[PDB]
Amino acid sequence: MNPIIYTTLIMTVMSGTMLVMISSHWLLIWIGFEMNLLAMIPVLMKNFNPRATEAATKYFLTQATASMMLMMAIIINLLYSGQWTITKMFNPVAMTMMTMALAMKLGLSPFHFWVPEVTQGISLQAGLLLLTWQKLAPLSVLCQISQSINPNLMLTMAMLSILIGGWGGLNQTQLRKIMAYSSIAHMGWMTAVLPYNTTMTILNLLIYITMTLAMFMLLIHSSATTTLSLSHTWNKMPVITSLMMVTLLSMGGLPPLSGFMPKWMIIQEMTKNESIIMPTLMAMTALLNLYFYMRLAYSSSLTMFPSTNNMKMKWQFEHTKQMKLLPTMIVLSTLVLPMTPALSSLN
Amino acid sequence: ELSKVTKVKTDRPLPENPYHSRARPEPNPEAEGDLKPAKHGSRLFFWTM
Amino acid sequence: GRIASFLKNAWAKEPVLVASFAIGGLAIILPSLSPYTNYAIRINRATPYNYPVPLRDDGNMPDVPSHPQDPQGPSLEWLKNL
Amino acid sequence: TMYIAFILSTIFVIGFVGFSSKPSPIYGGLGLIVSGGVGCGIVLNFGGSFLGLMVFLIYLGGMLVVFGYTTAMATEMYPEVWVSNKTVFGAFVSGLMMEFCMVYYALKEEEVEIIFKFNGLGDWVIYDTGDSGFFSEEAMGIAALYSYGTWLVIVTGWSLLIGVVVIMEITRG
Amino acid sequence: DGPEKNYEKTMAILQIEAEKAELRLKELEVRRLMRARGDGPWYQYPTIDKALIDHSPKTTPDN
Amino acid sequence: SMMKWNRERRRLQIEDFEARIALMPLFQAEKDRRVLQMLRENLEEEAI
Amino acid sequence: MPLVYMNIIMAFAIALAGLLMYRSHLMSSLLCLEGMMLSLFIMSTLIILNTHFTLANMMPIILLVFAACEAALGLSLLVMVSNTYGTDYVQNLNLLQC
């Protein structure tokens, strides 16, 4: 793909998300989602591969169904209210259908199935975009309609997302699939507090974005897609895998790392709303995410796997590409817990 | 010429409430006096500032 | 100079495209540089699609025409001349 | 002919069952052309002449014709009708039966409620008594897109152009 | 240092922490009331702006 | 030629619209009376 | 709601059911997806016309355009998949798992 064309497509994806976050008309939000899908498929298939084509097809099918259901819900709300503004939906059935569609766009379980497959099929850059930027628009729409969101349905979807993400991550060996299942679990965490406090969802989203950016960039820098390929990294660049260990521990949420902030604040808000069983189960299930993070950390840096003879040649050469944001992202995703009172800025 | 808006000097009183609208609800209290520093800052758990 | 040769070469080789660019270009520049565009707007506004809802005379509207056809009010004489 | 709109809507549902039974693509495409034509009829019955011809000219005329184009060039299927192998036949019959049950519960029982409330009264009631004069409400509003909806025009045009770009990038191999 | 120093410091710390606790409980109550009534500056979900409505003479007299 | 013809057509259209406007109040009066008459008849037969 | 609205919504539901329950050909799924777009067009058109939402008569057209764009996308993906595998069978899309 010509670089100019690629930049235009990336800007089109961004513009679709911006339209979703800028519009006050339901039709324009749906238009933004459609633009996102249209400009996302080629980005997913930048590197032409049969697996890439399969991932693109599955992604298109899921997002198309989601958009159909979203527009149907919009039309039903128009029928029962004669309103186009993105406010309190005035029809319960439309609300349910829209919730289903937006959850499918996010990847919340039981609409999680496509996320690991598509993530594995696409490249690490496309995976980064899919798991960070594509999560913004549906979350924005959900935040705007949080008042009308049925707490029971959303909580069920979020809890199932956490459970399924942990379980799936336990069994995976491919780094991309592990990242995808962890993303499912983190999206469950994000959407759990959506009915209660949207600002906490924004906080968790920002922390998740920083962590996933750091992790994906470290994977790209190490050019590893499997546990063993990442294991070989210690011989060449120990710094990268050690920083990966730190980021993985943050993703687990172990204090005093940044990952504790979102879980801590989420539990705070849920307990304020007299919900005690749900957050307890949420943390206890996030322990599984911690387990597969720890396994990856073991293989990567905490222990040393055998290497190959050809590594000697790679030792001589140095990485030419430089990801400018990576250091700042690592710092912001590891050491920011002393800065929780900055939560107010989000409000 | 027949399309020109014309004045009409009617004797029928102008309807006081043509839409027969109900009384509009009272607005919420609007703003307040000046802003002052938080009593103890961000009283978030252990943070003192 | 160099541009002039290019235009001659383009019309010699691909006259259809050269004409298309010229017609399209004029169809953009000429509208702004035309006085009848203002008239075209006025004609559209002049056309009375909907009824001219009368207003209640309050005694302090000299300009507004309180009559079928007298000097007060807008005039379509400009269109008649056109 | 007072219930013509209801008859058309039922035929619309029937065609939707026909193509939703996932038959041989060629037979399905027809199941969609028929339903599309019916839907255009319904829209015309409500007075949307321009929108009725829109689906006929674009959806049925172009969108479904390019769909048929693909089915014809990539033909790797054994032709079968909606009343063929039980996988399609049973689905078609069951869909028709569900629709007929809805119809009976809708006409015999005035206030039919499955997920939304429905009234068995003829749709002619919902029509509003009003005069537009020398106007085509549909046409005027749609033409207002160029005047009122400049933003919509911009976004839709950019989407179309980027769609051409995306199609080429995808189908370059 | 002298014991009285620690005594006064303890008194000050106790006052600060107790006032913080009072404010936290007060905030929780205020938030619940505002979210259950919508009569405060918080939880003011948007509504349609009346400025959009056009009151110009329409086509049909009965609006 | 088309410019002159179209301008004349616009003038004729304005004339026709003025005729419509002149006749509109009578039609509105008839319409409201007819609607109210039908409503009253429906009301009486509904009572019965 | 009038029975016509019920029928159109039921048509959308039926098309959605057909789309979600694949059989063999991915082409059939795309047909169901486009059918749903048609049903949404009809529903929105009727709603706008009845409400006399003059300024919103352009909504169905925009929906139609974007609908056919996303279809152009689906078809392009289908031919890529068919050229790679030989058929448009949904079962062929099996390399990616979980």
PDB file of C-alpha atoms in Angstrom, chain A residues 179 215 230 243-253 257 290 292-294 296-297 300:
ATOM      1  CA  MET A 179      -3.578  -9.914  24.120  1.00  0.00           C
ATOM      2  CA  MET A 215       2.803  -3.980  25.122  1.00  0.00           C
ATOM      3  CA  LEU A 230       9.473 -13.715  22.676  1.00  0.00           C
ATOM      4  CA  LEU A 243      10.030  -3.674  30.507  1.00  0.00           C
ATOM      5  CA  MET A 244       7.531  -6.178  29.107  1.00  0.00           C
ATOM      6  CA  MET A 245       7.585  -7.920  32.486  1.00  0.00           C
ATOM      7  CA  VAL A 246       6.805  -4.602  34.181  1.00  0.00           C
ATOM      8  CA  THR A 247       3.955  -3.847  31.758  1.00  0.00           C
ATOM      9  CA  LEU A 248       2.525  -7.358  32.169  1.00  0.00           C
ATOM     10  CA  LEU A 249       2.526  -6.942  35.945  1.00  0.00           C
ATOM     11  CA  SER A 250       0.720  -3.625  35.478  1.00  0.00           C
ATOM     12  CA  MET A 251      -1.828  -5.318  33.201  1.00  0.00           C
ATOM     13  CA  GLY A 252      -2.418  -7.817  35.991  1.00  0.00           C
ATOM     14  CA  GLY A 253      -3.127  -4.862  38.264  1.00  0.00           C
ATOM     15  CA  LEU A 257       1.707  -0.250  39.403  1.00  0.00           C
ATOM     16  CA  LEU A 290      -2.726 -12.199  36.288  1.00  0.00           C
ATOM     17  CA  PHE A 292      -1.381 -15.842  32.181  1.00  0.00           C
ATOM     18  CA  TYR A 293       0.484 -12.522  32.462  1.00  0.00           C
ATOM     19  CA  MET A 294       2.804 -14.201  34.971  1.00  0.00           C
ATOM     20  CA  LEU A 296       4.332 -14.843  29.857  1.00  0.00           C
ATOM     21  CA  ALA A 297       6.638 -12.914  32.199  1.00  0.00           C
ATOM     22  CA  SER A 300      10.120 -13.777  28.671  1.00  0.00           C
TER      23      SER A 300
END
